[PDB]
């Protein structure tokens, strides 16, 4: 691709510069080029990939929600709101397709860290979930099942291989519970998953890691917030 002539280490370096400059589309392009070199990504590099694409798709979701709300209130006079919502929607789907293609073609493997395997399967569940936020037809069922399957496989690994305070395990369970509540229309599943995750992290709080405990305690607070919202 466009990044094929650049050295891997230069791509990582430039992804970090782009983060500093808040140029997240650039930083995602740099990290996509890094992934396409075909070597595994370290934890720090997975964070770069994650931050870039989450920033890009987050702006698209935010835009799509604004336009969709305008579109729904105007359905209570021309084609313009729908066409522009469809435009942003198509771009969002393209970014999710790009991320999911990278996960399938390069990143999701049988080997490697529990951390890496759980994180990428979590990523796959998330980007299927973002596709499901804008899906409607026969696609929507296919996409919702794909999200669940990826989340569930990540959950199985994290529960076997990871302490209950691990921030990837926590963030996965947080995002799966959001899937249950907002996408799958299964509230009770979401409260029970979120409560089980919080309580189990709390019961084994001594497993907090000194290089990540701030991340763990952030996610357990977000679990509590969702539980307070949902109850």
């Amino acid at each position: 691709g466009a990044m094929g002539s650049m050295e891997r280490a230069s791509l990582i370096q430039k992804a970090k510069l782009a983060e500093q400059a808040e140029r997240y589309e650039d930083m995602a392009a740099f990290m996509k080029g890094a992934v396409e070199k075909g070597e595994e990504l370290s934890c720090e590099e997975r964070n770069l990939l994650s931050v870039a694409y989450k920033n890009v798709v987050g702006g698209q979701r935010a835009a799509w929600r604004v336009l969709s709300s305008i579109e729904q209130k105007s359905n209570e006079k021309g084609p313009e709101v729908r066409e522009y919502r469809e435009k942003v929607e198509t771009e969002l789907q393209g970014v999710c397709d790009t991320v999911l293609g990278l996960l399938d073609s390069h990143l999701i493997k049988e080997a490697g860290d529990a951390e890496s395997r759980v994180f990428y399967l979590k990523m796959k569940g998330d980007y299927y979930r973002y596709l499901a936020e804008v899906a409607t037809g026969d696609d929507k069922k296919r996409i919702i099942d794909s999200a669940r399957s990826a989340y569930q496989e990540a959950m199985d690994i994290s529960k076997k291989e990871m302490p209950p305070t691990n921030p990837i395990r926590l963030g996965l369970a947080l995002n799966f519970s959001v899937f249950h509540y907002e996408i799958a229309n299964s509230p009770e599943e979401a409260i029970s998953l979120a409560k089980t995750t919080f309580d189990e992290a709390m019961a084994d709080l001594h497993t907090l890691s000194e290089d990540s405990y701030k991340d763990s305690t952030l996610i357990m607070q977000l679990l509590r917030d969702n539980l307070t919202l949902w109850t």
Partner: peptide, 10 residues
């Protein structure tokens, strides 16, 4: 008010 998912960090 929607649910809160995992945020960006670091």
């Amino acid at each position: 008010q929607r649910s809160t998912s995992t945020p960006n960090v670091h």
